[PDB]
UniProtKB/Swiss-Prot annotation, chain B:
Subunit structure of this chain's protein: Binds to host ACE2. RBD also interacts with the N-linked glycan on 'Asn-90' of ACE2. Cleavage of S generates a polybasic C-terminal sequence on S1 that binds to host Neuropilin-1 (NRP1) and Neuropilin-2 (NRP2) receptors. Interacts with host integrin alpha-5/beta-1 (ITGA5:ITGB1) and with ACE2 in complex with integrin alpha-5/beta-1 (ITGA5:ITGB1). May interact via cytoplasmic c-terminus with M protein. May interact (via N-terminus) with host bilirubin and biliverdin, thereby preventing antibody binding to the SARS-CoV-2 spike NTD via an allosteric mechanism.
Organism superkingdom: Viruses
Glycosylation sites: T29, S31, N45
Protein name per the record: Spike protein S1
Chain residue ranges for the region called Disordered: 25-37
Function of the molecule: Attaches the virion to the cell membrane by interacting with host receptor, initiating the infection. The major receptor is host ACE2. When S2/S2' has been cleaved, binding to the receptor triggers direct fusion at the cell membrane. When S2/S2' has not been cleaved, binding to the receptor results in internalization of the virus by endocytosis using host TFRC and GRM2 and leading to fusion of the virion membrane with the host endosomal membrane. Alternatively, may use NRP1/NRP2 and integrin as entry receptors.
Effect listed in the UniProt record for changing G41D: In strain: Omicron/BA.1, Omicron/BA.2, Omicron/BA.2.12.1, Omicron/BA.4, Omicron/BA.5, Omicron/BQ.1.1
Consequence the record notes for mutating G41H: In strain: Omicron/BA.2.75, Omicron/XBB.1.5, Omicron/EG.5.1
């Protein structure tokens, strides 16, 4: 999920303010990526032994 | 597009793998505006 686009629809007026909350935008991607990365590790170890 | 990922890892060493660089968007070409009668021919004429 792209925080920048989700929160602020395609508009810099909102995009500027989002910069003030810092990593809240990014670290979510890190969280979600953290999920989606291992989601294939699940299927990895379950099915391919 | 390669240089923008190294700014995501903050490292000059980029480990073998796939990394997600900033998203891209398609941008708009143009704007499309799409929309009785008052008796001014009956008043003014």
């Amino acid at each position: 999920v792209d925080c920048t686009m989700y929160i602020c629809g395609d508009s810099t007026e909102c995009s500027n303010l989002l910069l003030q909350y810092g990593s809240f935008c990014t670290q979510l991607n890190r969280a979600l990526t953290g999920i989606a990365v291992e989601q294939d590790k699940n299927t990895q170890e379950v099915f391919a032994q | 597009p390669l240089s923008e990922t190294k700014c995501t890892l903050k490292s000059f060493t980029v480990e073998k793998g796939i990394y997600q660089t900033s998203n891209f968007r398609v941008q708009p070409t143009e704007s499309i505006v799409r929309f009785n009668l008052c008796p001014f021919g009956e008043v003014f004429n």
